[PDB]
Amino acid sequence: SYDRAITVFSPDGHLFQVEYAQEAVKKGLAAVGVLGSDSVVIAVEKKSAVKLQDSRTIRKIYKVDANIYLAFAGLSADARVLINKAQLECQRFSLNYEDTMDVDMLVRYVAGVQQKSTQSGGSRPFGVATVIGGFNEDGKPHLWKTDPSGMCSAWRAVAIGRHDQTVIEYMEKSYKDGMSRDECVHFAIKSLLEVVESGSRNIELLVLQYKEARYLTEEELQKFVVEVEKEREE
Amino acid sequence: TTIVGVVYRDGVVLGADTRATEGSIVADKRCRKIHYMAPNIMCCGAGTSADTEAVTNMVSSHLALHRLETGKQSRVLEALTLLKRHLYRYQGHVSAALVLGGVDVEGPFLATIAPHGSTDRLPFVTMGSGSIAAMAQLEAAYKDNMTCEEAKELVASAIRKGIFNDPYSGTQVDVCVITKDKTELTIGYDKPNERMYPRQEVLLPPGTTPVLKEEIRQL
Amino acid sequence: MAETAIAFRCKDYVMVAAAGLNAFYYIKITDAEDKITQLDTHQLVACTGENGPRVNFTEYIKCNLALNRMRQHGRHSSCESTANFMRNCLASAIRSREGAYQVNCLFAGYDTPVSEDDDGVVGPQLFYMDYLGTLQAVPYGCHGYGACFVTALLDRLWRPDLSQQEGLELMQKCCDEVKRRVIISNSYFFVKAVTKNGVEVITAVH
Amino acid sequence: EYDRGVNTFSPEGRIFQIEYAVEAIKLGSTSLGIRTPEGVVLAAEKRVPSTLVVPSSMSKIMEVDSHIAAVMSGMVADARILVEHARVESQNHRFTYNEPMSVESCTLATCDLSIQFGLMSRPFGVSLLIAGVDEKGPQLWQTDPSGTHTRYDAQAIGGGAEAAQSVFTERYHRNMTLEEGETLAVDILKQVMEDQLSPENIEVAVVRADDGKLHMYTPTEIKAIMSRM
Amino acid sequence: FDKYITVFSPEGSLYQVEYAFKAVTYPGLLTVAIRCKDAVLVVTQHLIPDRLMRPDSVTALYEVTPNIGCCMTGRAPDGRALVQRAREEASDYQYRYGVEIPIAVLAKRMGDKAQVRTQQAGLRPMGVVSTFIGMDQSDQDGSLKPQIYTVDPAGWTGGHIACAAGKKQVEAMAFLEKRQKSTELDALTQKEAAMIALAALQSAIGTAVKAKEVEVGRCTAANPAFQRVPNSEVEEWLTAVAEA
Amino acid sequence: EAFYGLTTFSPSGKLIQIEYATTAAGKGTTALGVKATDGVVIAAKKKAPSTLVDASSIQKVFVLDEHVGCTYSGMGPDCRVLIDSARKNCQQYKLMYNEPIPISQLVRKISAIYQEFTQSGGVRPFGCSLLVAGVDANGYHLYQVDPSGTFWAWKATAIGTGSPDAKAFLEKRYTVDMELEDAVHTALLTLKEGFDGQMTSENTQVGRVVENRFEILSVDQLRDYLDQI
Amino acid sequence: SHRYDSRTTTFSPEGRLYQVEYAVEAIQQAGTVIGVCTKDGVVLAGEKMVPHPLFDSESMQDKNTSGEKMYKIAEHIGCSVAGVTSDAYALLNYARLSALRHQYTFQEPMAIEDLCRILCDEKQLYTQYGGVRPYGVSFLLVGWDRYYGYQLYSTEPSGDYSAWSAYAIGQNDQVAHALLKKDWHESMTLEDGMLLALRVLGKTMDTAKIDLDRVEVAVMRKVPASNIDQLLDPFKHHPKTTPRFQILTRSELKPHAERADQAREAEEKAE
Amino acid sequence: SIMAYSGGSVMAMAGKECFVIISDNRLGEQLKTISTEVPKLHVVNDSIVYGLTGLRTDQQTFANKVQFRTEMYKLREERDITGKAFAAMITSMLYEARFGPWFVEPVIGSIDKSTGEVYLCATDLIGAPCEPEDYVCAGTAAESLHGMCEALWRPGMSPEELFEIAAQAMLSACDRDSLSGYGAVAMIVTKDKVTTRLIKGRKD
């Protein structure tokens, strides 16, 4: 088997392959997560809406288990692999422990797969950050992020992809605890529009409440984009 | 099953009966038990039909391949070694029992391979459930430097002893003659069993059997 | 064999019943182990045999179905799919190191249009499986010591077009015959049906 | 950077990837450890990248076992791996010998995973401090990416380390109380941190000699330390 | 970048294989082989400059099987290794088929072995030219015909009537081509052949050879086993060359 | 033990090692093939380096099975690899289906081996092209396989050195009506075009697919065709 | 040997994977393929290479299983490839087995999007593990399943894939996209899609008329089911219609190509 | 016996440019009948049909393996498998499993579409073929089916005559086998035409 060492320290302490995976995640589409009282909101940029892509709904927020949902930024195909692994892990877990996987457990599994790939000979890192959101089987909502180094962290709100840090600086200023469902969706839409152009056909947005996951219809979303783009003039 | 080989002045004759049983029922009255192995080598088999077919095919194929590598004619002793090595490895579980006969540059070559992978090169041989009956006609009549006809008659005679005395053997005698130049296989060299009452056409005219449904489909 | 399961399918439902008994040699532990496992919204499997196998087999299927429904954006597998997956899993096991899953199933489902494009079979489906991975569509079937009493009773009484109510009545005669004639107390039966509207538990029969 | 394979020695007798992994530990958040006869103290700069982070989630101090804690500096994800192995090893020890693993034995078994690189593409870019209490009383060790453990009485790792080894040299005596230790810990962090030291910005834990159990200071109890200074 | 690994150059050539051919001539030894009607001979130089080296200990002639000799020309230890592999091949073949490996098959298998080293990276091609000689039974009459098969570092295998490898392999060949326009080489006698071989060796290396500076190997229809020809008899051929 | 790939994409999208292998495979001597209504002929130059080579021992045309043959250009020993594998495949197929492998399936199998050596680690591609000619239930066939692993059915073609010109000359003389006597005549005429020196039944080899079998012409049979050109 | 490793699965400094970028360059060199997803079927129209007069047919007995650009993966799944042809055949064989393993296990047709994920997982692998080069191939898959109806995906060497209503891979894909943008709509017949597929294909390869010699067309559509053998499994349901992948003979395609000359003559009148 | 557990019998016979293959319909676990609507025939293509007998789970498994193989064949090869290949293939598959066999016993009928040459082949469970010219058969009622086919079968029958003697034979024999019955399904296969017929039998 090919087991050359791909990820290695350079002189000044850095792991270039991991810095470059992270560069691939800064080129990816933005995604944003917001945590309210009883809701997690995951919102992602879509690439645009060319008249050619299938008008059948393709989700860019992925379901990992009943209770857990994952957005990503970076290489689509890497992401798809991570997600399949995550999906398969949550089932392995149900199957071993009967209980459903806590979100944090799922996140740690994923981050470990990411970390593992910065240290496995033969492989480059996944060039993927993830936002992961969901509720445990105790009504507590969570929101996490993984980066390609394999580091995860829980957040009250978060952004990944292009201009992540512009968006995170924005959100630090505004964000309050104990938002409502509707204030969450607002806050997420607001935050995304810091970097996305229109709010028309280039935002998918998912709302997670204990035991109920629901994507905004393109209509429900547009009442929120007007309600928000009208608040950006001021 | 009764197979037989003899060496004669110019070559080898093999012979076989043709009854393929299953259990105590004749599944096929007229199967071929004399397998092609090479242009100058044939095999007959006895034992477990499936094992015999697998093994001869495998070796036949290997020798075909080996013949393209080497450009030469297959040697009967390569055939034999491939067979015995294979059978030996399966410790009898591959219950093929072969008579192998060919003619190579070194002359006629007749041999038995037993399922455990022993060989015995000899001037006449038998295998199969009919083997003892047939062997007795060979011991009684074999001689060195038989003419081809002498050899065929004797091989047929020996196979008839199995056909008529072994239950597992029957129908008719097939023989194969192998000379340096060519391999002439002759099905029904002896047919000593016609049927003695002509079949009685039982008349069953269309619509005789009650049908419930029918689907026809054209092509 | 100690725990009898029964099923049959009419035009608009498939109804499945299975004995609560859980035993340990002769010691009756409960008459209330539900051995009818719902696998999906319109698919359930009445499964009989030792808890070990029965639970591991059913939990495997239930997971793999669930997995596959993720990796397929929320779409329900057809009942024939699921049954073939179960069959292949059983079958594979009889030639495995571990050995046959000693369980016998009735797999019942109701197939609804999965989309606008689905030209597929609509309605109730019922399959008889055995631990070796035999798999046969049947209009009714049974496993267990009562299996034969009931099977002959259904051959007598079942019609393809029973109402949901005639079905409860008929299932009750089935359960009752198993109590009348099997030495093993199958005192309580769980009963469920699948319809266009999913799995309903049925408490009117036991 | 792939010019030299990863098992290569420099002309000074150092393996290059090890020296580089060490360089990565100087980019890390400062962590530190103080042996006292009353117990050990670990303290870490959390160094969160945002107020939006939930600080419990960026846990630079980790229970290895009831009596052992570790605190990393460098690549956190790499540290999660080592601590998972320590946890497994510490628990295998209880399993097998029905007693708590010594702290040294634990540190060893965590270095036993760091030797492995050629297997692991590269070394872990992580230094741990592993405080604990066993039969020989409170103890503090340091792993490096070399795989070389080293018992210490006080130590820092991270960007701080040089400034914090100044302060230990002056103020650390082998005979301080657990409260004077807590205090010196938090002092050092105040001095070397980038940010303003607040009760959420840091993480403090102690393994007390008396019970031999590890307590993670809540933000409250860390204020109770900042109080007296 | 292509000069050091077994990938193609832009001209479509494998440098490391070409350079392996230079390893064949680098030692400065020449070998010649030749078949006559009922024998085949291989003559190789056997140079022992070191007075203290033990002549009988160094050789480029090797029994592969009793009926196949070979002469390796080139990097000696690479030759020794091919011989081991040949030997293994020959022995695995006897085990599998119950018969001694025909020499054209052995050559072919050794060409396969070499070819592999030219297509899989990081295995150095063996820098030798292998020359197997032996008799070969015909399927028509059962008569033994003599054979010379080479294999080279590219894996190119060939049968020959006569062949030279090593330093001045060109001037040796040129001499034999020239002597093949006169006579028919497969109608010669083991003597007339050996004379031609020895004369070709002498022409090429620009010197007269003595017996102890060559070593000669032979197979004959009469005695098919491969045998080192004794010096007495090589002396007599060398005498027969200087005269006529 | 080298497992990295040697063939890789280059900034224009080309796989350069494969272009070079293709260059190598057109440096052989000329081989060509002509399909006809009732057979196929393939024919190659055997340009022996010297007269001292036993030309009987040089094989440029090969039986793969009773019904199918090949010849090749470019590097002989690379081709010997392909031929060995193709012979095996023919036989594996008979063992399975107890029929002869159809040429289409055979060539796809060859194509696949070539492709593996364009992607698998450690190996360079094959530097030879094949013609494969044979007869199956779909009739007579003639295919070219290149080192890319690409293959083409042809009615006539030529690989190796004189090949552009040989192809040009086959374009003229080829007719869809052609019978096999004329095909051979055309094949041999086409070789002769770019042949330095006399053609003999020694320095040329010819294979024909006729009826249901492939055979390499004897020197006797080939001499009768070379007396009519 | 490690000095000579070209490090195919490494990132470059902008998080780019060069071997995958360059596989894409290889694909933009390939014969154009157009796909158009209607509601009566899917159409693939591809540029064959220029037909030398000495090319033969393979004389295959089944005309619809493969052509030069178009291959059937299963009864319900077809594809067309652009890029390194031999890589295609490796993958195509993989996709065939996958679809049939799915059918082994579940006894129903694999859905198009799962076949597609399987395929692209196989590609993604080579961009991450293994130190060899990626598959230099782009599919257009088409087919029909009960979940989503007619579908048309396209894959890339990275392993990403996307669903489309219409799309193009190969040579002048940017140009062909722009032209499908303008002329695709949601309510096309099959004939309309076949037209659109040819108008675009003929517009990208710069021909006055469509050059029947240089064009292959395949269609994936549902047709009446013939071999309902219902006495043989009584309980099994057999749908009235079933998907069929069809490659058009030169003659079946002649009308549709004339009809696209006529809508290229009637678009040079307005000018 | 494992080969008898699931019950079922199959039989194929040749006529002039046609064959009939026929199965009974029962599926059992020993003496328990589970279904009376389980014909054991599979259609590979217009010219090949086969039946399996033996342990039903293995019939199912193996038939599915055969359908993978055959569909794969048809894609790779772009033609229909022929009965000789088909039977060789099967034999191969069964023999792979020689040391842990599939408990099935296939019975294959086929007709070359051109010629009209008819090929029957039955195999034991490890894949020894039996390629007679008349009729082959397998399953629980196999002794009796040989009885009947010997008696009734003659050379050069036409589809109809051949159907009648196939059906009488399958039914007469199945009426003497506890594990086979509930009438039969039969496919008559000519060059031009396939005809399936469900035949009425006893309900015991």
Automatic annotation (TrEMBL), chain B:
<dbReference type="GO" id="GO:0005634">
    <property type="term" value="C:nucleus"/>
</dbReference>
<keyword id="KW-0888">Threonine protease</keyword>
<comment type="subunit">
    <text>Component of the proteasome complex.</text>
</comment>
<dbReference type="InterPro" id="IPR000243">
    <property type="entry name" value="Pept_T1A_subB"/>
</dbReference>
<dbReference type="Pfam" id="PF00227">
    <property type="entry name" value="Proteasome"/>
</dbReference>
<comment type="function">
    <text>Component of the proteasome, a multicatalytic proteinase complex which is characterized by its ability to cleave peptides with Arg, Phe, Tyr, Leu, and Glu adjacent to the leaving group at neutral or slightly basic pH. The proteasome has an ATP-dependent proteolytic activity.</text>
</comment>
<keyword id="KW-0647">Proteasome</keyword>
<keyword id="KW-0539">Nucleus</keyword>
<dbReference type="InterPro" id="IPR029055">
    <property type="entry name" value="Ntn_hydrolases_N"/>
</dbReference>
<keyword id="KW-0963">Cytoplasm</keyword>
<dbReference type="InterPro" id="IPR016050">
    <property type="entry name" value="Proteasome_bsu_CS"/>
</dbReference>
<feature type="active site" description="Nucleophile">
    <location>
        <position position="1"/>
    </location>
</feature>
TrEMBL record, chain F:
<dbReference type="Pfam" id="PF00227">
    <property type="entry name" value="Proteasome"/>
</dbReference>
<dbReference type="GO" id="GO:0005634">
    <property type="term" value="C:nucleus"/>
</dbReference>
<comment type="subunit">
    <text>The 20S proteasome core is composed of 28 subunits that are arranged in four stacked rings, resulting in a barrel-shaped structure. The two end rings are each formed by seven alpha subunits, and the two central rings are each formed by seven beta subunits.</text>
</comment>
<comment type="function">
    <text>The proteasome is a multicatalytic proteinase complex which is characterized by its ability to cleave peptides with Arg, Phe, Tyr, Leu, and Glu adjacent to the leaving group at neutral or slightly basic pH.</text>
</comment>
<dbReference type="InterPro" id="IPR050115">
    <property type="entry name" value="Proteasome_alpha"/>
</dbReference>
<dbReference type="Pfam" id="PF10584">
    <property type="entry name" value="Proteasome_A_N"/>
</dbReference>
<dbReference type="InterPro" id="IPR001353">
    <property type="entry name" value="Proteasome_sua/b"/>
</dbReference>
<keyword id="KW-0539">Nucleus</keyword>
<dbReference type="InterPro" id="IPR000426">
    <property type="entry name" value="Proteasome_asu_N"/>
</dbReference>
<dbReference type="InterPro" id="IPR023332">
    <property type="entry name" value="Proteasome_alpha-type"/>
</dbReference>
<comment type="similarity">
    <text>Belongs to the peptidase T1A family.</text>
</comment>
<dbReference type="InterPro" id="IPR029055">
    <property type="entry name" value="Ntn_hydrolases_N"/>
</dbReference>
TrEMBL record, chain G:
<comment type="function">
    <text>The proteasome is a multicatalytic proteinase complex which is characterized by its ability to cleave peptides with Arg, Phe, Tyr, Leu, and Glu adjacent to the leaving group at neutral or slightly basic pH.</text>
</comment>
<dbReference type="GO" id="GO:0019773">
    <property type="term" value="C:proteasome core complex, alpha-subunit complex"/>
</dbReference>
<dbReference type="Pfam" id="PF10584">
    <property type="entry name" value="Proteasome_A_N"/>
</dbReference>
<feature type="domain" description="Proteasome alpha-type subunits">
    <location>
        <begin position="4"/>
        <end position="26"/>
    </location>
</feature>
<keyword id="KW-0539">Nucleus</keyword>
<dbReference type="GO" id="GO:0006511">
    <property type="term" value="P:ubiquitin-dependent protein catabolic process"/>
</dbReference>
<feature type="region of interest" description="Disordered">
    <location>
        <begin position="247"/>
        <end position="271"/>
    </location>
</feature>
<comment type="similarity">
    <text>Belongs to the peptidase T1A family.</text>
</comment>
<dbReference type="Pfam" id="PF00227">
    <property type="entry name" value="Proteasome"/>
</dbReference>
<dbReference type="InterPro" id="IPR029055">
    <property type="entry name" value="Ntn_hydrolases_N"/>
</dbReference>
<comment type="subunit">
    <text>The 20S proteasome core is composed of 28 subunits that are arranged in four stacked rings, resulting in a barrel-shaped structure. The two end rings are each formed by seven alpha subunits, and the two central rings are each formed by seven beta subunits.</text>
</comment>
<protein>
    <recommendedName>
        <fullName>Proteasome subunit alpha type</fullName>
    </recommendedName>
</protein>
Automatic annotation (TrEMBL), chain H:
<dbReference type="InterPro" id="IPR033811">
    <property type="entry name" value="Proteasome_beta_3"/>
</dbReference>
<dbReference type="Pfam" id="PF00227">
    <property type="entry name" value="Proteasome"/>
</dbReference>
<keyword id="KW-0647">Proteasome</keyword>
<keyword id="KW-0539">Nucleus</keyword>
<keyword id="KW-0963">Cytoplasm</keyword>
<comment type="function">
    <text>Component of the proteasome, a multicatalytic proteinase complex which is characterized by its ability to cleave peptides with Arg, Phe, Tyr, Leu, and Glu adjacent to the leaving group at neutral or slightly basic pH. The proteasome has an ATP-dependent proteolytic activity.</text>
</comment>
<dbReference type="InterPro" id="IPR001353">
    <property type="entry name" value="Proteasome_sua/b"/>
</dbReference>
<dbReference type="GO" id="GO:0043161">
    <property type="term" value="P:proteasome-mediated ubiquitin-dependent protein catabolic process"/>
</dbReference>
<dbReference type="InterPro" id="IPR016050">
    <property type="entry name" value="Proteasome_bsu_CS"/>
</dbReference>
<dbReference type="GO" id="GO:0005737">
    <property type="term" value="C:cytoplasm"/>
</dbReference>
<dbReference type="InterPro" id="IPR029055">
    <property type="entry name" value="Ntn_hydrolases_N"/>
</dbReference>
<dbReference type="GO" id="GO:0005634">
    <property type="term" value="C:nucleus"/>
</dbReference>
